[PDB]
């Protein structure tokens, strides 16, 4: 089967089973059937938030107004306080999730609509709630299911780019996009740092600490600068 490394020899416990299994386990965390099932949800969860997140920042910049994203201040301003939202954020996501988390651990018991009964679906796959969540079904096959991971697993991997780039380069995702294509051999953060024997240069973080928001510290330091190239 296709693998992450075309000449590789996939680990024993992982063969051709889960959606999109290319045989990648340096550490072999999937050998445990119980925990791998847990991890199986996380990959979707981390993926499905990042995808919707990475598409957020990009749209947040190019079509939208341009402030690379550290912003509390917006042009949707701050309509209802903050502690107003965070109040409603907790109770919202609390119900939303400890609900879905229970369909992971003890499957099917949640399918009923709490108020009245339209239910949902049969028990299906713990991390793929059918029915009301997936009405449209653009592709008709689990080919589309393998098609979902390979997008997300890139986006999660892509998101980390936005952090680090916006650390030292101090610019949004698509700003440095165009900045690279102009004089490409510059701005690789390969050029921009060396650390050979003797000499060590590192670019300094272009975002500062102590960002002022409504009279609050918010230290927000850089991510482990000392070990940067």
């Amino acid at each position: 089967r296709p693998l992450w490394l075309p000449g590789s020899t996939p680990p024993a416990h992982l063969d051709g089973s889960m959606t999109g299994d290319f045989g990648w386990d340096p550490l072999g965390l999937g050998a445990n059937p119980e925990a791998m099932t847990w991890f199986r949800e996380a990959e979707l969860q981390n993926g499905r938030w990042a995808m919707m997140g990475v598409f957020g920042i990009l749209v947040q910049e190019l079509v939208k107004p341009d402030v690379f994203w550290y912003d509390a201040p917006t042009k949707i301003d701050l309509p209802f306080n903050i502690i107003g939202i965070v109040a409603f954020q907790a109770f919202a996501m609390h119900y939303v999730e400890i609900r879905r988390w229970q369909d992971l651990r003890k499957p099917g018991s949640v399918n009923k609509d709490p108020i009245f009964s339209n239910y949902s679906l049969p028990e299906h796959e713990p991390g793929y709630p059918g029915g009301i969540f997936a009405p449209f079904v653009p592709g008709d096959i689990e080919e589309l299911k393998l098609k979902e991971l390979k997008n997300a697993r890139l986006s999660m991997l892509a998101f980390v780019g936005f952090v680090m780039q916006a650390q030292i380069t101090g610019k949004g995702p698509i700003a440095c996009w165009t900045d690279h294509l102009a004089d490409p051999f510059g701005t690789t953060i390969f050029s921009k740092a060396v650390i050979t024997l003797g000499g060590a240069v590192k670019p300094t973080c272009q975002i500062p600490d102590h960002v002022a928001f409504q009279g609050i510290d918010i230290p927000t330091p850089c991510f482990f600068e000392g070990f940067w190239p």
């Binding site: 000449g7 020899t9 490409p184 051999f185 390969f190 050029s191 003797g198 240069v201």
Partner: protein
């Protein structure tokens, strides 16, 4: 059969037959043994022999065709040509790494298992033919000889020229290091007045700077022997 062994009286080691290319039955360190090591070492001997053969020719090509620019340096963004010089080596090295890291990992995994992936990815309709561990060339030999006609005889000429280079190229690096002269230059000195141009002189001096920095204080140069 015994071709000719390196020393006149010697016993070719058991694992050394002469099945391989340039075998003289010389492994006095006994280092190659348990052929899983041999396969590995052979790969290096090839890869080294090749980069040397390209290296030796590339050095002669530099100095002959660019009389300035002492060879052993050539690196720092001074000697560089006109279109370059301002490509920011840190971005030049960037361009190299991703290129070599693929090809080398591509070759390494084809040592681990064998005949495993000799096939193109992407288009994935095509492949290099059979070999033994390091003799590809469906693409890598376009011109098709060393196929039907004598093959290992060309393999034999490959090593014996390769080993020559690895030594010859090594001469370059130590000559240019002590003398401060390109290969054909230090050769020209010798032909001029050999007795006083000999290695007898100009030993005990590495005559190399210890900084040689580009965008910083960078790149310590440790020479080879501690000649002052």
């Amino acid at each position: 059969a015994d071709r000719k062994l390196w020393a006149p009286g010697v016993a070719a080691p058991s694992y050394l037959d002469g099945s391989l290319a340039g075998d003289y039955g010389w492994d006095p360190m006994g280092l190659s043994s348990d052929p899983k090591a041999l396969a590995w070492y052979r790969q290096a001997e090839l890869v080294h022999s090749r980069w040397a053969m390209m290296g030796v020719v590339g050095i002669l090509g530099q100095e002959i065709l660019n009389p300035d620019v002492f060879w052993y340096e050539a690196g720092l963004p001074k000697n560089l040509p006109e279109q370059v010089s301002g490509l920011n080596l840190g971005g030049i090295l960037a361009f190299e790494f991703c290129m070599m890291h693929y090809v080398e990992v591509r070759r390494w995994q084809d040592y681990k298992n064998f005949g495993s992936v000799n096939e193109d990815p992407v288009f994935k309709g095509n492949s290099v033919p059979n070999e033994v561990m390091g003799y590809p060339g469906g693409i890598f030999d376009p011109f098709g000889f060393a196929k039907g006609k004598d093959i290992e005889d060309l393999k034999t000429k490959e090593i014996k020229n390769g080993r020559l280079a690895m030594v010859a190229w090594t001469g370059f690096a130590l000559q240019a290091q002590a003398t401060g002269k390109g290969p054909i230059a230090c050769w020209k000195d010798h032909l001029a007045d050999p007795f006083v141009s000999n290695i007898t002189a100009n030993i005990g001096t590495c005559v190399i700077p210890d900084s040689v920095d580009v965008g910083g204080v960078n790149i310590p140069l440790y020479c080879l022997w501690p000649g002052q």
